[PDB]
Amino acid sequence: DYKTKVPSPYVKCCGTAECRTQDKPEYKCAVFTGVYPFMWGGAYCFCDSENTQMSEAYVERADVCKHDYAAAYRAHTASLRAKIKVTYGTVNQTVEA
Amino acid sequence: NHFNAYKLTRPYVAYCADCGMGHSCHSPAMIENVQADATDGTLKIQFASQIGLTKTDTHDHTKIRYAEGHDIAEAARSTLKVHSSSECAVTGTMGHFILAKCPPGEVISVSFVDSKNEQRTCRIAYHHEQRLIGRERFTVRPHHGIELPCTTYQLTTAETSEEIDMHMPPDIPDRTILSQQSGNVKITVNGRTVKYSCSCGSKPSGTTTTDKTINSCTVDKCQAYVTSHTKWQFNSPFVPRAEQAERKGKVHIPFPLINTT
Amino acid sequence: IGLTKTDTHDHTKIRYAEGHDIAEAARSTLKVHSSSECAVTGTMGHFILAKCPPGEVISVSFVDSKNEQRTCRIAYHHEQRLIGRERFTVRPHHGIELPCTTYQLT
Amino acid sequence: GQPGRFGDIQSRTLDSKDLYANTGLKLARPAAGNIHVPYTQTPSGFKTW
Numbered sequence: 001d002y003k004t005k006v007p008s009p010y011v012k013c014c015g016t017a018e019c020r021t022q023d024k025p026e027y028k029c030a031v032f033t034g035v036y037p038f039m040w041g042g043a044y045c046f047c048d049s050e051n052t053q054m055s056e057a058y059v060e061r062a063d064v065c066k067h068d069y070a071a072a073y074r075a076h077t078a079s080l081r082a083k084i085k086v087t088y089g090t091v092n093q094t095v096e097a
Numbered sequence: 098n099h100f101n102a103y104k105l106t107r108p109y110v111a112y113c114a115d116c117g118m119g120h121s122c123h124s125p126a127m128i129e130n131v132q133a134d135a136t137d138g139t140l141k142i143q144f145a146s147q148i149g150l151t152k153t154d155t156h157d158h159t160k161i162r163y164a165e166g167h168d169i170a171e172a173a174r175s176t177l178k179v180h181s182s183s184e185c186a187v188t189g190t191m192g193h194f195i196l197a198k199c200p201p202g203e204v205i206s207v208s209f210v211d212s213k214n215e216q217r218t219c220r221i222a223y224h225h226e227q228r229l230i231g232r233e234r235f236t237v238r239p240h241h242g243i244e245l246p247c248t249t250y251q252l253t254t255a256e257t258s259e260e261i262d263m264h265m266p267p268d269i270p271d272r273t274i275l276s277q278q279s280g281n282v283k284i285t286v287n288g289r290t291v292k293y294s295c296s297c298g299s300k301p302s303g304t305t306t307t308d309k310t311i312n313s314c315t316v317d318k319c320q321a322y323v324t325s326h327t328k329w330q331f332n333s334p335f336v337p338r339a340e341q342a343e344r345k346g347k348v349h350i351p352f353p354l355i356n357t358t
Numbered sequence: 359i360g361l362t363k364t365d366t367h368d369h370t371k372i373r374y375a376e377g378h379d380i381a382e383a384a385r386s387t388l389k390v391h392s393s394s395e396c397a398v399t400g401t402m403g404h405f406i407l408a409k410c411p412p413g414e415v416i417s418v419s420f421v422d423s424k425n426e427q428r429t430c431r432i433a434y435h436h437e438q439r440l441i442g443r444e445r446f447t448v449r450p451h452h453g454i455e456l457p458c459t460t461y462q463l464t
Numbered sequence: 465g466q467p468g469r470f471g472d473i474q475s476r477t478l479d480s481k482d483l484y485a486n487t488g489l490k491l492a493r494p495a496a497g498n499i500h501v502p503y504t505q506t507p508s509g510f511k512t513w
């Protein structure tokens with residue numbers, strides 16, 4: 001199973017950011033204009049028309065599947081082993097071969 | 098006993114989707130997710146406030162910690178509840194994480210009473226269907242029969258090899274600073290560090306701690322901020338970050354799952 | 359609810375009839391529950407509105423000064439409505455805004 | 465990596481530091497007021513299987 005790690009959405013008021021990429025699985029950058037974040041303290045910043053929000057997220061292998069997982073194999077020819085009983089009156093042995 | 102690992106950790110208040118009904122107040126009862134990657138049926142719920150540690154960093158059994166008005170307060174654990182459709186019992190309380198077993202349903206929720214004697218709750222959509230083991234469809238552990246292999250969580254409250262990261266609160270907006278005069282503003286009442294900023298352009302932002310006067314403008318021009326940290330927080334996706342984008346702190350994920358019957 | 363014998367606005371106490379006198383009792387022991395423990399949201403006068411999960415019954419129980427839990431139940435075929443085209447059970451944190459009809463707390 | 469069929473995440477061993485994914489991930493603009501990260505994704509294929 002996978003997981004969606006989402007770091008914090010750094011918001012810049014009356015400015016703009018530039019997201020330098022990362023060698024990572026599906027590092028996805030998105031920059032939005034025209035935001036008005038309204039948190040507990042009234043507004044977060046004080047500006048009206050140049051606000052930008054940065055949201056970044058990536059997809060990563062979950063932490064528990066070190067113990068459960070499916071594994072696909074290619075499957076080729078096999079071998080054969082046997083176990084026999086060899087009783088002929090004189091002492092009866094068992095054998096694997 | 099010692100296990101300390103936490104000395105710089107502070108709760109937060111985040112946003113949620115229900116607060117009893119409809120009005121989605123930014124509440125102290127965030128739920129980040131519900132991990133259900135075990136096999137018995139239990140749920141490992143991680144929520145906003147943290148439990149087990151008192152105000153100034155000491156191991157407790159029955160007192161819990163939480164936040165209100167960006168200052169620290171406490172409550173009790175014996176008055177906390179978790180349920181989905183019917184009241185289900187908690188099975189373990191440690192640090193920042195809730196641990197329980199619970200019947201099916203389509204919602205999960207946590208609640209506890211406030212130090213102002215209230216009943217703050219929080220609900221969040223999540224589907225929990227009874228995952229079955231063996232070739233039967235039971236619901237309760239019987240007394241006669243056979244057993245089968247299965248994974249579950251262990252109550253060892255100090256164990257390594259899993260973690261989340263920690264950051265610091267960026268800055269806390271407010272307009273509710275003691276700043277009022279007839280044509281002027283009065284520029285603090287506080288006990289901590291503050292960064293002020295405005296747009297009546299004669300003086301830039303600064304890091305004052307004593308009172309000032311800006312003598313000029315009506316109050317709907319300046320907005321104030323709490324500033325640099327004393328402790329750390331969790332990089333929850335619901336509060337922004339400052340320009341210190343790092344991985345300063347990190348903290349145990351307790352209860353590693355192990356083979357059982 | 360809300361009215362002690364002498365006219366006042368108490369947010370906690372409730373007036374009822376026993377022995378055709380006028381006895382008080384607080385809201386800190388009033389619960390409603392149909393299929394789970396229901397959750398009240400707004401309490402005024404001679405009516406009570408609340409959200410709570412669907413089922414077949416409904417209940418009111420509050421406790422008197424002699425500490426008994428008098429209650430009454432009735433049958434009612436309440437079930438979850440279908441707004442839009444995806445039958446949820448819990449409001450999510452992002453979606454589409456739609457016309458519905460709710461109650462006002464004034 | 466057909467998103468939502470068997471094994472939309474793939475790893476060449478238990479502990480390789482590189483991996484591959486085609487989860488079908490996109491982003492959307494938030495609402496008025498709420499600060500969060502609206503992300504649209506196909507749900508898991510493995511948990512489906």
Ligand SMILES: *[C@@H]1O[C@H](CO)[C@@H](O[C@@H]2O[C@H](CO)[C@@H](O[C@@H]3O[C@H](CO[C@H]4O[C@H](CO)[C@@H](O)[C@H](O)[C@@H]4O)[C@@H](O)[C@H](O[C@H]4O[C@H](CO)[C@@H](O)[C@H](O)[C@@H]4O)[C@@H]3O)[C@H](O)[C@H]2NC(C)=O)[C@H](O)[C@H]1NC(C)=O
Nearest residue numbers: 064066067068246247248249353354355356357477478479
């Ligand atoms: C429930 O119980 C199961 C048992 O079936 C547990 O599975 C075991 O988990 C351990 C922990 O990782 C596994 O141990 C590791 O196994 C890897 C795979 O084993 C290969 O190599 C061994 C050599 O001993 C062969 O026998 C086997 O056929 C495989 O080819 C190894 O790669 C790991 O080790 C490397 O380093 C160590 C030294 O550190 C060397 O000794 C190894 O040789 C190797 O070079 C490590 O040994 C174990 O294999 C798992 N069992 C099985 C059958 O695979 C589950 O983990 C448990 N549940 C939970 C939740 O823990």
Ligand SMILES: *[C]1O[C]([C][O])[C](O[C]2O[C]([C][O])[C](O3[C]4O[C]([C][O])[C]([O])[C]([O])[C@]43[O])[C]([O])[C]2[N]C([C])=O)[C]([O])[C]1[N]C([C])=O
Nearest residue numbers: 082083084085086087088089090091092093094095096097
């Ligand atoms: C040798 O030879 C013989 C013949 O005789 C044989 O045998 C027989 O066989 C059988 C089978 O196995 C046996 O049996 C046994 O025992 C057991 C114990 O436990 C049981 O369980 C079973 O059931 C059975 O019975 C018999 O015994 C015999 N007989 C005699 C011996 O007599 C054998 O096998 C051979 N081998 C050897 C080693 O002996």
